[PDB]
Write an enzyme that holds these catalytic residues in place. Structure first.
Site, PDB file in Angstrom:
ATOM      1  N   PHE A  36      -3.735 -14.361  -1.279  1.00 18.57           N
ATOM      2  CA  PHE A  36      -2.642 -13.710  -2.054  1.00 18.57           C
ATOM      3  C   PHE A  36      -1.246 -13.716  -1.800  1.00 18.57           C
ATOM      4  CE2 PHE A  36      -4.680 -10.600  -5.048  1.00 18.57           C
ATOM      5  CZ  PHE A  36      -5.792 -11.431  -4.819  1.00 18.57           C
ATOM      6  N   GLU A  62       0.753  -1.157   0.180  1.00 21.04           N
ATOM      7  CA  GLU A  62      -0.033  -0.138   0.147  1.00 21.04           C
ATOM      8  C   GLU A  62       0.822   1.297  -0.016  1.00 21.04           C
ATOM      9  OE1 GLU A  62      -0.736  -2.902   1.754  1.00 21.04           O
ATOM     10  OE2 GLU A  62      -2.272  -3.079   0.311  1.00 21.04           O
ATOM     11  N   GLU A  71       2.688 -14.068  -3.756  1.00 19.45           N
ATOM     12  CA  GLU A  71       3.554 -13.512  -2.957  1.00 19.45           C
ATOM     13  C   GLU A  71       4.725 -14.520  -2.572  1.00 19.45           C
ATOM     14  OE1 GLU A  71       1.522 -11.210   0.166  1.00 19.45           O
ATOM     15  OE2 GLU A  71       1.064  -9.730  -1.186  1.00 19.45           O
TER      16      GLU A  71
HETATM   17  N1  LIG Z   1      -8.832  -3.146   4.959  1.00 22.75           N
HETATM   18  C1  LIG Z   1      -8.654  -3.694   3.671  1.00 22.75           C
HETATM   19  N2  LIG Z   1      -8.282  -2.555   2.761  1.00 22.75           N
HETATM   20  C2  LIG Z   1      -7.961  -3.038   1.436  1.00 22.75           C
HETATM   21  N3  LIG Z   1      -8.208  -4.375   1.110  1.00 22.75           N
HETATM   22  C3  LIG Z   1      -8.177  -5.259   2.233  1.00 22.75           C
HETATM   23  C4  LIG Z   1      -8.315  -5.024   3.339  1.00 22.75           C
HETATM   24  N4  LIG Z   1      -8.693  -6.093   3.941  1.00 22.75           N
HETATM   25  C5  LIG Z   1      -8.606  -6.975   3.111  1.00 22.75           C
HETATM   26  N5  LIG Z   1      -8.307  -6.538   2.112  1.00 22.75           N
HETATM   27  C6  LIG Z   1      -7.924  -7.431   0.833  1.00 22.75           C
HETATM   28  O1  LIG Z   1      -8.491  -8.930   0.980  1.00 22.75           O
HETATM   29  C7  LIG Z   1      -7.575  -9.616   0.185  1.00 22.75           C
HETATM   30  C8  LIG Z   1      -7.590 -10.932   1.054  1.00 22.75           C
HETATM   31  O2  LIG Z   1      -6.491 -10.383   1.851  1.00 22.75           O
HETATM   32  P1  LIG Z   1      -6.233 -11.051   3.287  1.00 22.75           P
HETATM   33  O3  LIG Z   1      -6.132 -10.193   4.381  1.00 22.75           O
HETATM   34  O4  LIG Z   1      -6.722 -12.296   3.348  1.00 22.75           O
HETATM   35  O5  LIG Z   1      -4.539 -11.544   3.062  1.00 22.75           O
HETATM   36  P2  LIG Z   1      -4.006 -12.203   1.555  1.00 22.75           P
HETATM   37  O6  LIG Z   1      -2.951 -12.725   2.065  1.00 22.75           O
HETATM   38  O7  LIG Z   1      -4.987 -12.827   0.883  1.00 22.75           O
HETATM   39  O8  LIG Z   1      -3.581 -10.845   0.884  1.00 22.75           O
HETATM   40  C9  LIG Z   1      -2.752  -9.895   1.250  1.00 22.75           C
HETATM   41  C10 LIG Z   1      -1.261  -9.975   0.856  1.00 22.75           C
HETATM   42  O9  LIG Z   1      -1.030  -9.748  -0.618  1.00 22.75           O
HETATM   43  C11 LIG Z   1      -0.728  -8.532  -0.734  1.00 22.75           C
HETATM   44  C12 LIG Z   1      -0.100  -7.811   0.506  1.00 22.75           C
HETATM   45  F1  LIG Z   1       1.163  -7.658   0.412  1.00 22.75           F
HETATM   46  C13 LIG Z   1      -0.387  -8.679   1.641  1.00 22.75           C
HETATM   47  O10 LIG Z   1       0.768  -9.547   2.028  1.00 22.75           O
HETATM   48  C14 LIG Z   1      -6.171  -8.980   0.105  1.00 22.75           C
HETATM   49  O11 LIG Z   1      -5.796  -8.916  -1.404  1.00 22.75           O
HETATM   50  C15 LIG Z   1      -6.468  -7.438   0.655  1.00 22.75           C
HETATM   51  O12 LIG Z   1      -5.960  -6.539  -0.367  1.00 22.75           O
END
Ligand SMILES: Nc1ncnc2c1ncn2[C@@H]1O[C@H](COP(=O)(O)OP(=O)(O)OC[C@H]2OC[C@H](F)[C@@H]2O)[C@@H](O)[C@H]1O
Ligand SMILES: Nc1ncnc2c1ncn2[C@@H]1O[C@H](COP(=O)(O)OP(=O)(O)OC[C@H]2OC[C@H](F)[C@@H]2O)[C@@H](O)[C@H]1O
EC number: 3.2.2.-
Lengths: 251, 251
Positions: free
Chosen positions: B174, B98, B179
């Site tokens: 994700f 972010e 990742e």
């Molecule tokens: N408050 C929020 N604001 C915007 N987007 C959000 C929010 N809460 C959850 N999400 C989305 O819900 C989806 C499921 O998140 P997850 O938390 O299950 O973890 P993931 O490992 O799948 O994905 C987070 C990893 O991937 C990229 C980073 F580097 C992390 O290590 C995610 O893609 C989040 O963007």
């Protein structure tokens, strides 16, 4: 001291970003559009000397850019920028001036007028500690006034009680200068939070020194009043960044 | 589900804001300028069906918008958005996706292509859980790839150890999808932090359940490995929001 590049563009982008995506459930939208807002901002200072400003110079801008503020959620602070903003939590717990349209657009930017085209200076701006006070503090002073003036309900003030040089309350801080004396009858109370940095000598305390003065001041205003030193919620923040300080031990 | 108003303008403003004021000492500037970036962004999805995207659709754009990342300062998370971002402290302590340009411009926005002019839809976007996975995850999956890929040194991963439904590590989060598998040889180690929400039943631990799986998986990658549960720094964070929970008692 170097002015912010492409001032106009940064102003209009921050402004658009805010208009549309920021503090949406937290602060109401402002009514002027962006180039309306800018127009007023630019007029305030353009085409004059840097030092040719007073406290009225951005009156119109802050008139257009003022937003009504949530009841009991306004915070103020002195000498604790980081901790006050961490605790306020981007509008979630409290509102700081930096969260409002005008604070957000202008935060951290450096600018000044010049008499010669384009009306402002892209090479340099003077310390401002070389200007009369009313210039020096033209913008952020009027900013704080508008802010303090639109506060309703309870307000909170965070201070630094660990400073030998700077007292917790001072009548020439921005708080004491533009914020406190501008609060209106719509405000009911002032909760004060005295931060006591970890590891470091304690200086100010509730009911003594400047805080005794502030207390009296506030009472005269017909406001309620309370004060607390390192409430747990705040204490834990500090500790988060310094989990070994003697104050942070676990049961 | 409503698309973000004035998409272009928000994108370009967020972009100018960043370019000039955000993370200056923390992330390097990108090279493309803003309408260069926007061109590649728009191209990726305009004049097609919302559902017409795969994983390569925003390849160019992330090529332009990628920034090299601080050694050891890269963080990932799963299911702890708030806590991970608090802990990372706007890049001061770690970097989250972010905080990068692309993550920052696009954070929270809603958009989608349509075939008829102007290329995109300003009334509605389908609930992407109606699209094929590669469409649904076109943008943020690629985003996580390019991110993960650019990591060097030590990396940290934060996980939620308090969830009966969702295990701490899942190969289709994700994290496990885009990742982990994209980490390069420049990465030396994975520090894992297991969040145990206060007041609530403990589910996963180090060396058991999925964290046993993840551990082995990480070792096969030739990476070092450690794991802690509620380290003090994090612990105080939680406590800050919930200073009465049994876990938070003072000596
Ligand atoms: N408050 C929020 N604001 C915007 N987007 C959000 C929010 N809460 C959850 N999400 C989305 O819900 C989806 C499921 O998140 P997850 O938390 O299950 O973890 P993931 O490992 O799948 O994905 C987070 C990893 O991937 C990229 C980073 F580097 C992390 O290590 C995610 O893609 C989040 O963007
Ligand atoms: N317009 C401004 N608004 C906020 N901060 C500013 C402004 N201009 C300069 N600063 C910074 O503040 C320091 C000046 O004293 P200080 O911050 O220790 O405490 P003050 O009462 O004097 O000003 C903060 C209160 O006024 C409005 C807020 F909402 C607070 O409740 C300087 O070192 C600058 O870093």
């Amino acid at each position: 001291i170097v002015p912010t590049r492409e001032l106009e563009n940064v102003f209009l982008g921050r402004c658009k970003d805010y208009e549309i995506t920021r503090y949406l459930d937290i602060l109401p939208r402002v009514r002027s559009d962006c180039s309306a807002l800018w127009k007023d901002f630019f007029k305030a200072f353009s085409f004059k000397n840097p030092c040719d400003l007073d406290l009225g110079s951005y009156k119109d801008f802050f008139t257009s850019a003022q937003q009504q503020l949530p009841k009991n959620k306004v915070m103020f602070w002195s000498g604790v920028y980081d901790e006050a903003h961490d605790y306020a939590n981007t509008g979630r717990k409290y509102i700081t001036l930096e969260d409002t349209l005008p604070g957000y657009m202008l935060n951290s930017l450096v600018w000044c007028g010049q008499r010669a085209n384009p009306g402002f200076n892209e090479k340099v701006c003077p310390d401002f500690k070389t200007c009369p006070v009313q210039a020096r503090e033209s913008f952020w002073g009027m900013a704080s006034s508008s802010y303090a003036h639109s506060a309703e309900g309870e307000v909170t003030y965070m201070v630094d009680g660990s400073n030998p040089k700077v007292p917790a309350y001072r009548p020439d801080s921005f708080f004491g200068k533009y914020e406190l004396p501008n609060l209106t009858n719509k405000v009911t109370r002032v909760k004060v939070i005295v931060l006591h940095r970890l590891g470091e000598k304690i200086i100010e305390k509730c009911g003594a020194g400047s805080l005794l003065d502030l207390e009296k001041l506030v009472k005269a205003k017909h406001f309620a009043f309370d004060c607390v030193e390192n409430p747990r919620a705040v204490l834990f923040l500090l500790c988060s960044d310094n989990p070994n300080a003697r104050e942070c031990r676990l049961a």
